[PDB]
Amino acid sequence: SVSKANVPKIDVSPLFGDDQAAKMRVAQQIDAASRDTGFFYAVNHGINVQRLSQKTKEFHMSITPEEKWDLAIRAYNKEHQDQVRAGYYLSIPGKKAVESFCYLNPNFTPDHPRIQAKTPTHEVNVWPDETKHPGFQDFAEQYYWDVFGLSSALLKGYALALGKEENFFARHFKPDDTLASVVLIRYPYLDPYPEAAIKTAADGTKLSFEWHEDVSLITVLYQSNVQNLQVETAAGYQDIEADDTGYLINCGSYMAHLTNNYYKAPIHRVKWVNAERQSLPFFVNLGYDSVIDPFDPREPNGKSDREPLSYGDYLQNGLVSLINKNGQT
């Protein structure tokens, strides 16, 4: 018997406005969700998720093996030593079902100063041929800025929830240097489904991806309407119901660090389900040099003894640790 997680739906529309009391009421709801299971659905968010899902499906279903090799990250193509993050993450027929395409800040061009300096975690996006995938790049870059805007608004809610001025986090989340990424993940229907792609949890549950905390400040996720996520509580894992009109939000481990675990990074995992579906996360990352001094909201003086952590060092170590723990995706 598996219970269902309490995942509230929060109308985030006030976070785009100037009614300050309404924004406080949203912040209270974010606080409550963040101290309970750690997940909530953002509704009334203003993003055209129907077009997002359609354009992503057209891409996943039309790209060919030749194109996948040409876009592949270094894990699948040793010629692409500069693609650690951005590019195509191939499936392996008979062994690995999931495949995905990851892209970063569209402002990271060859002329960008972080690219000129060869700073770790910064890469120039690779894209398919425009003639084979017309309008895909335009759509994907536009989507990045659309979800960037939603994420900026959410960060104002988190700041207010913790008793800070609304730009406390958002001031470090800038178009010129954000390390945020979009991943367009396809989970396919397969018959027979490769047994190598199913992991068995300690409790017997069949999984597609094992337990983890997110490498992010917050994670802003759109998924098609197939139930798959579970969140760990002290009484075991609970199912998160799907909603293909909303964005599922949770904190990552950088938030847990800077709040002395007041807002924990919820541990979650992905159940195996044999269904064609999409999982489209946006990982809200700050800039490479961004540092927020930790504080403890439980203490009157907010004092914390935790060391400030540069976001770049956090991200480089976190991404590698996640690969080592849960596998190359």
Ligand SMILES: CC(C)[C@@H](NC(=O)[C@H](CS)NC(=O)CCC[C@H](N)C(=O)O)C(=O)O
């Ligand atoms: C749980 C979902 C978010 C999704 N899982 C994921 O996206 C998992 C766990 S949060 N995330 C990752 O592998 C990190 C990708 C980081 C990305 N390459 C980058 O360079 O920024 C899934 O559906 O498997």
Ligand SMILES: [Fe+2]
């Ligand atoms: Fe995650």
